[PDB]
Design an enzyme around this catalytic site. Structure first.
Site, short mmCIF file in Angstrom:
data_model
loop_
_atom_site.label_atom_id
_atom_site.label_comp_id
_atom_site.label_asym_id
_atom_site.label_seq_id
_atom_site.Cartn_x
_atom_site.Cartn_y
_atom_site.Cartn_z
N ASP A 148 4.63 62.93 50.01
CA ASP A 148 3.31 63.41 49.52
C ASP A 148 2.96 62.95 48.05
O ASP A 148 3.96 62.44 47.30
CB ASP A 148 2.82 64.89 49.64
CG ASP A 148 3.64 65.68 48.83
OD1 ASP A 148 4.67 65.45 48.10
OD2 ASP A 148 3.43 66.89 48.76
N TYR A 171 2.39 62.85 43.79
CA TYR A 171 3.00 63.48 42.92
C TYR A 171 1.90 64.47 42.57
O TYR A 171 0.69 64.27 42.64
CB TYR A 171 2.91 62.59 41.49
CG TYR A 171 4.00 61.34 41.61
CD1 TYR A 171 3.86 59.97 41.98
CD2 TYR A 171 5.28 61.93 41.81
CE1 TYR A 171 4.76 59.03 41.94
CE2 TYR A 171 6.57 60.73 42.03
CZ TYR A 171 6.13 59.37 42.22
OH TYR A 171 6.95 58.48 42.09
N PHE A 201 5.14 56.42 45.35
CA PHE A 201 6.34 56.11 44.42
C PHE A 201 5.76 55.64 43.10
O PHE A 201 6.17 55.76 41.86
CB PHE A 201 7.21 55.22 44.81
CG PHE A 201 8.21 55.91 45.80
CD1 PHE A 201 8.19 55.13 47.00
CD2 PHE A 201 9.31 56.51 45.40
CE1 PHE A 201 8.93 55.97 47.92
CE2 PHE A 201 9.86 57.16 46.30
CZ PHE A 201 9.75 56.81 47.73
N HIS A 210 17.56 58.61 50.30
CA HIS A 210 16.44 58.57 49.40
C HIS A 210 16.86 58.23 47.88
O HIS A 210 18.04 58.42 47.48
CB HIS A 210 15.65 59.98 49.32
CG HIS A 210 14.53 60.02 48.54
ND1 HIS A 210 13.22 60.02 49.28
CD2 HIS A 210 14.32 59.96 47.29
CE1 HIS A 210 12.20 60.08 48.38
NE2 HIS A 210 12.85 60.04 47.32
#
Lengths: 230, 83
Positions: A66, A68, A78, A188
């Site tokens: 989702d 920031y 990102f 990740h």
């Protein structure tokens, strides 16, 4: 009624009146929620990930979760808006790029627009979040839409790379045609995973060679490769 | 209890959470040595004065129940503290 998507994306998704009603419903749901709290990003930015190239020119799909939740989201996965620190995962993405591409030097910013315009889709599965509340909008209807984008990308593109980082992004591999497409997996880029044991289900992010392997696949498939420099 | 408050509560440093990454119990257990009862949000901030990554592990929304605190060295080493 605005579905927020560019005409190219509407033309690409061939949304049925049913799916159009679905998208409008979530969009509407979010409008409701905004009268009650601060929601990131702005509505005219929540679909920014779709405004950088023709969807049929997508070559690499990179999934986030989702947006920031502290004001730094810019409608891409990102990436952060101007003036915000480069976040930990992105710093780690820059490290893998620097480790694997002799010509990459990590930038001092988190604007990924140069990738996006080349057909790298920076797609969060959830497109909105309430200020200070990660995961707050996880069950409002975004997941059907982004699952649908993922599925149509797989279906409609001759050949495409999908970068699935972490077990949660990994769940989306079921939507993707592994015969046509290169599905790249690893842990990740989060700093946490770095200290995971030797025998992990997934390989370390730092060392995954994802950005080189993407260009190898693109090249063999006769497509333009990504210049990852920022 | 704000997520920002927890970090300052625990560490004394005034850091903004820069990202909150959701992880499954198995991939967390690989790092922590303990398995969480469900999904975990990895709320992380960089402390530039020390060059370390500060990670608050919390349960998913809306509870955000604190689970562990990890501080990662400039050298890659993890200091783990169950909460």
């Amino acid at each position: 009624e605005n579905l927020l998507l560019p005409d190219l994306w509407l033309d690409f998704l061939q949304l049925s009146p049913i799916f159009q009603r679905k998208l409008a419903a979530v969009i509407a749901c979010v409008r409701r929620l905004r009268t009650q709290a601060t929601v990131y990003p702005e509505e005219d930015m929540c679909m920014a990930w779709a405004r950088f190239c023709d969807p049929s020119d997508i070559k690499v799909v990179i999934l986030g979760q989702d947006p920031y939740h502290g004001g730094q989201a810019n409608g891409l996965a990102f990436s952060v808006a101007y003036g915000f620190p480069v976040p930990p995962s992105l710093r780690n993405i820059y490290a893998e790029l620097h480790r694997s591409l002799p010509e990459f030097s990590p930038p001092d910013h988190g604007c990924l627009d140069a990738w996006a315009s080349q057909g790298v889709l920076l797609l969060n599965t959830i497109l909105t979040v309430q200020k200070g509340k990660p995961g707050s909008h996880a069950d409002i209807g975004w997941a059907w839409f982004t699952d649908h984008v993922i599925s149509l990308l797989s279906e409609r593109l001759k050949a495409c790379v999908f970068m699935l980082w972490g077990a949660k992004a990994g769940d989306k591999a079921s939507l993707i045609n592994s015969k046509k497409h290169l599905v790249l997996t690893s842990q990740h880029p989060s700093p946490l995973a770095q200290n995971s044991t030797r025998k992990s289900a997934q390989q370390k992010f730092l060392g995954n060679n994802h950005f080189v392997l993407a260009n190898n696949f693109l090249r063999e498939k006769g497509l333009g490769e990504i210049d990852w420099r920022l | 209890t704000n997520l920002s408050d927890i970090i300052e509560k625990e560490t004394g440093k005034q850091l903004v959470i820069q990202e909150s990454i959701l992880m499954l119990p198995e991939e967390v257990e690989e790092v922590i040595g303990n398995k969480p009862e469900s999904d975990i949000l990895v709320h992380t901030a960089y402390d530039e004065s020390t060059d370390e990554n500060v990670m608050l592990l919390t349960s998913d929304a809306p509870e955000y129940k604190p689970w562990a605190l990890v501080i990662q060295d400039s050298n890659g080493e993890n200091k783990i503290k169950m909460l």
